[PDB]
Coordinates of C-alpha atoms and ligand atoms in Angstrom, one line a residue:
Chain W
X1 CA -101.5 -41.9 74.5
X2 CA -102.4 -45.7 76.1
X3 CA -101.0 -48.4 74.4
X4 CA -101.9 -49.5 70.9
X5 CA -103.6 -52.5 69.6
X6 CA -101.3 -55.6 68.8
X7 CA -101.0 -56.9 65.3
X8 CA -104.0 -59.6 65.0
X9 CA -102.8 -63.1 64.4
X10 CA -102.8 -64.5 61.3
X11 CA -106.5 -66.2 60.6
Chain D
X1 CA -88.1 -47.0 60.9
X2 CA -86.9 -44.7 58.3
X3 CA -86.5 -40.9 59.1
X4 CA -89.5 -39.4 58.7
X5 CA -92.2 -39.2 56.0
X6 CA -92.4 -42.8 54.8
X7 CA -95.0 -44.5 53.0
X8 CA -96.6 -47.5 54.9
X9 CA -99.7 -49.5 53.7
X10 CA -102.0 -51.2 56.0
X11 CA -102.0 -54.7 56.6
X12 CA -105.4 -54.5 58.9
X13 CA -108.4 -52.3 58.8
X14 CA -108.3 -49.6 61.6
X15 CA -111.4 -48.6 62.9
X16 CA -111.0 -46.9 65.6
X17 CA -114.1 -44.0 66.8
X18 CA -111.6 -41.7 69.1
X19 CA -111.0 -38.8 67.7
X20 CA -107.7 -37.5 66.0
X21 CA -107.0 -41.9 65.1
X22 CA -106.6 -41.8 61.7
X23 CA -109.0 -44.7 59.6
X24 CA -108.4 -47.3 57.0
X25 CA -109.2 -50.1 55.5
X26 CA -106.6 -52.7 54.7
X27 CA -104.1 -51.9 51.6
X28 CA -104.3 -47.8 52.5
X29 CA -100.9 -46.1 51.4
X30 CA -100.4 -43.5 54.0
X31 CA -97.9 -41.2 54.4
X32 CA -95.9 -41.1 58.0
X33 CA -95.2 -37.2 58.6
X34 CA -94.3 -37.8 62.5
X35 CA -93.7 -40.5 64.9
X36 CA -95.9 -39.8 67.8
X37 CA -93.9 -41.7 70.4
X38 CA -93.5 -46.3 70.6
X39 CA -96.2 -47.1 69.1
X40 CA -98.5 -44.8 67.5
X41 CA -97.7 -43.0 64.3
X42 CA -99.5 -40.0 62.9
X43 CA -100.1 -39.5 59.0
X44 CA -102.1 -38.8 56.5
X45 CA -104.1 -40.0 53.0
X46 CA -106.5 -38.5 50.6
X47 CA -109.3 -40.5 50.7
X48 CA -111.6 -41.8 48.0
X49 CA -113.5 -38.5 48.1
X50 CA -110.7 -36.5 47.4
X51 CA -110.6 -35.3 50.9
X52 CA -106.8 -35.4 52.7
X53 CA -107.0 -36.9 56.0
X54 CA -104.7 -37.0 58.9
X55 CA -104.4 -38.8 62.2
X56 CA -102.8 -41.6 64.7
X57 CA -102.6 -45.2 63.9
X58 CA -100.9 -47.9 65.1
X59 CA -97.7 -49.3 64.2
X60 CA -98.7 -52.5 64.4
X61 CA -101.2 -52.1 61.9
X62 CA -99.3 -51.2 59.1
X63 CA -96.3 -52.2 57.1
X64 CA -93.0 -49.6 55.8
X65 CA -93.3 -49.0 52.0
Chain T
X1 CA -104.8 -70.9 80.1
X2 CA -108.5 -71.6 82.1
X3 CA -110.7 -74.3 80.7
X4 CA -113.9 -73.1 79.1
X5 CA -116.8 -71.1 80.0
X6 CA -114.3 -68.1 81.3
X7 CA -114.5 -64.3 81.3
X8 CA -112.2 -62.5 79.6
X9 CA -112.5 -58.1 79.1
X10 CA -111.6 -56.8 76.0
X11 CA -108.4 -54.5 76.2
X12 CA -108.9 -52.9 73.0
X13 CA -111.7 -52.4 70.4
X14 CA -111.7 -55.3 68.2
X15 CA -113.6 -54.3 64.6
X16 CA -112.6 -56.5 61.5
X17 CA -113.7 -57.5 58.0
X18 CA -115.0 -60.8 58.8
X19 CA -118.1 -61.9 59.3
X20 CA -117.3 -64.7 61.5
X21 CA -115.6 -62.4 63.7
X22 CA -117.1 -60.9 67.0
X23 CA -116.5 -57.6 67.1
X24 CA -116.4 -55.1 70.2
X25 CA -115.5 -52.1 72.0
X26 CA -112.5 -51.7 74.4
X27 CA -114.0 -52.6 78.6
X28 CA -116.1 -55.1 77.0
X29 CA -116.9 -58.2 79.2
X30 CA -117.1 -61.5 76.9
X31 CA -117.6 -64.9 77.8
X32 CA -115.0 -67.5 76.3
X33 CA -116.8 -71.0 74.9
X34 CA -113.9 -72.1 72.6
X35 CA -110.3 -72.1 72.2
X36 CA -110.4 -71.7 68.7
X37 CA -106.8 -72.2 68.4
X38 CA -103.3 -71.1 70.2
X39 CA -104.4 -67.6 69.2
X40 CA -107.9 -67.0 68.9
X41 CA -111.1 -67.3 70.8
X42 CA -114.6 -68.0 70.4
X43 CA -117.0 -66.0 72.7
X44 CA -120.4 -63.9 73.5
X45 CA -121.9 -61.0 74.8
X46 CA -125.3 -59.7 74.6
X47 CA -126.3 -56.6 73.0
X48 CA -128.8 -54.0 73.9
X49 CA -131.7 -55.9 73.2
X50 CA -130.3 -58.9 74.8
X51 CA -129.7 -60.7 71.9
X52 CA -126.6 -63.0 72.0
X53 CA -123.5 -61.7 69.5
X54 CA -120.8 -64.3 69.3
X55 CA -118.0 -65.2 66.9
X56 CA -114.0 -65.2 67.1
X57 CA -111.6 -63.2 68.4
X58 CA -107.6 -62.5 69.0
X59 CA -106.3 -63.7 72.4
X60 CA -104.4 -60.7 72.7
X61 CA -107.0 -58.5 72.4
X62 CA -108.1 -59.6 75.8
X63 CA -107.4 -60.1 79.0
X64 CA -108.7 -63.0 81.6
X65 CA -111.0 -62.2 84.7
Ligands
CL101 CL1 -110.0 -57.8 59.1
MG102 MG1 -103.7 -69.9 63.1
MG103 MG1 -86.5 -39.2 53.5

């Protein structure tokens, strides 16, 4: 597949 | 990693509307069954309907055991 | 990093719990009008009907241009 989504930040 | 199936739970809802990604909200215990290759795993739950589901998810988006 | 208005395109589909949050779909064209902080944004876009949807967003859901 493409590349997965980063880990979002922290809020 | 561990070798293959592991339990993860999600730190992030996924969302995602391709098909075959695997959905959850934040907190799902999935089981891994296969690592699909860097950075996608596939696995599967039963959801709240009873209903086992299966799919790919990101890595990134969950956490092991 | 460009100082504010800029254009950024969304590199992945963004869709979280929070209200404050904008949420999108992956090729999405948003315009930056915040830093937030060093790792979120504050943007828009407009929707079908032209209405203006804005809220916050990961950096690294994004790229510049
Ligand atoms: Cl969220
Ligand atoms: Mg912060
Ligand atoms: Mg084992």
């Amino acid at each position: 597949r493409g590349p997965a989504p980063p880990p979002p930040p922290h809020r | 990693e561990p070798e293959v199936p592991f339990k993860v739970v999600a730190q992030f809802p996924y969302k995602s509307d391709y098909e075959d990604d695997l959905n959850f909200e934040k907190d799902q215990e999935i089981i891994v069954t296969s690592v699909e290759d860097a950075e996608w795993y596939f696995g599967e739950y039963q959801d709240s309907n009873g209903d086992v589901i299966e799919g790919i998810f990101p890595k990134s988006f969950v956490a092991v055991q």
